[PDB]
Amino acid sequence: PQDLSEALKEATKEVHTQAENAEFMRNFQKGQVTRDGFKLVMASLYHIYVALEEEIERNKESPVFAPVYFPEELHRKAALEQDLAFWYGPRWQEVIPYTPAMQRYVKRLHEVGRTEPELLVAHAYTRYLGDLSGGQVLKKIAQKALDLPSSGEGLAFFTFPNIASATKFKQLYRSRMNSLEMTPAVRQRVIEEAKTAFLLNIQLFEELQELLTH
Amino acid sequence: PQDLSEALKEATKEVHTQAENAEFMRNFQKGQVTRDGFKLVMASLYHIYVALEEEIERNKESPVFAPVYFPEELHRKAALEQDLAFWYGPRWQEVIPYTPAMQRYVKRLHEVGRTEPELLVAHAYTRYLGDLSGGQVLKKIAQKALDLPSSGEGLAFFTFPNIASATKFKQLYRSRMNSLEMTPAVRQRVIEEAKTAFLLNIQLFEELQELLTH
After folding, report:
1. Residues B82-96, buried b or exposed e (16+ Cβ, 10 A)?
2. CA end-to-end span of chain A, whole Å?
3. In this UniProt entry, which residues form the Cytoplasmic topological domain(s) (chains A, B)?
4. Of A23, B53, B60, B66, whose CB count within 10 A is highest?
């Protein structure tokens, strides 16, 4: 594939299925998800998005990332803050877990953002477009499996308010990715970094599943 | 009193009382409010907070507002975009109402922000401490009256996730308010703007009631 976006999709097809096959995620897909498991997933997201959005802000002007910079349409940090206040209560910042698997993911994000900005696009792609695509499917499953009350909160993360059409924004982002100018070498390190992104998610799923079976 | 915070709370005591008596807000207390009436309120808040917050960003560096600049703890724009996406849909931005009462409020905010930003503190105080202070009781009422689906969204506005204790934060804020430096003239106008702020709210409630009952 010549386009970076098409190259990413095909290069990450295997790990994507692997992330899909992970037990925690399999259980999820099969509506097998508990409150404790969901809390852990949300806590993970908060830490990952804080780190990712912190690095995007650091590189938003760089020509290696600027093209795919969409802060208003994609930022998730605030949505997660709102959500964790529901799941863990008002003192959530004090009690939310921060596991080694979460830290490994966060650590890589800062490294890329601070020493290999050119690769940041790989993580923003994996996270944003992934959470965007399978957003609804996972939300519907969760709300019907978590039997939530009606307090009007806890799932803001699954709704991107500043995006009218997912499909159409999905195409714009793909276009912007393809506009990125880079050496075939960098173009290859980015593809690699995308696979590393899934691997970091896969090991997170493995860890959370382990923490929940005691 | 000698303290700005004590002056504002005492100077706006009557306009506050009248604000709690405006028919619309009055019925909201009796747990009486429809989805349409609530949607109008949320729409109004989105507009007011967009204006207030963009003006707060303009003058955040100035000595007239910096002391009370608490972006993470208080921003509401994002929480309202999330809720409006739920109440109005993906195209909420293209269809929420923008009425005369909403506009007069927005107008004054930009006016103060552009010509007398030394008064913004009066608007930040009125809105933030006011919404934070009542946010919890209004939320339980909203829940009881609106019968929301169990989809975890639509009331994010009523929760300030980055504030563990409303009590402890209000203390620091009042403290930051009293550290504010200003001439007697300016201090008098700030006290006045706080009243103006309340009336802009009263004016909005009366307008909203007239749209719901004709």
Report:
1. bbbbbbbeeebeeeb
2. 45
3. 1-214
4. B53
Q: What residues of B are in contact with residue A152 (Cβ under 8 Å)?
A: 83, 86, 139, 142-143, 146, 148, 152-156, 158
Best of A54, A139, A147, A151 to substitute, by most chain B Cβ atoms within 10 angstroms, is A151
- The residue among B122, B101, B112 whose CA lies nearest residue B209 is B101
Q: Which of B148, B149, B156 sits opposite A156 (nearest CB)?
A: B156
Please spell the DSSP secondary structure of B16-29, one letter per residue: HHHHHHSHHHHHHH
Q: What is the resolution of this structure in A?
A: 2.1
CA pair distance A148, A137, nearest whole angstrom: 17
Q: For B124, phi and psi rounded to 5 degrees?
A: -65, -45
Which phi and psi angles does B97 have, rounded to 5°?
Answer: -75, 155
Tokens 């009042």 identify what position? Answer: B174
Task: Map out the domains of chain A as residue ranges.
Answer: 1-214
Q: What angle do CA B192, B194, B197 make, to 5 degrees?
A: 115
Which is nearest to B192 in space by CA: B34, B11, B68? B11
Give SS3 for B3.
coil
Q: Is B127 annotated as a binding residue?
A: no
Q: Which of A86, A93, A143 sits opposite B151 (nearest CB)?
A: A143
CA distance B154 to chain A (A): 5
Helical H runs in chain A?
4-11, 13-21, 23-29, 35-59, 71-74, 77-87, 92-95, 100-115, 120-124, 130-133, 135-145, 166-178, 184-211
> A83 and A155 in contact (C-beta within 8 Å)?
yes
d(CA B120, CA B194): 9
Q: Which of B53, B91, B153, B167 to mutate against chain A (most A CBs within 10 Å)?
A: B153
Domain B1-214 top-level CATH class: mainly alpha
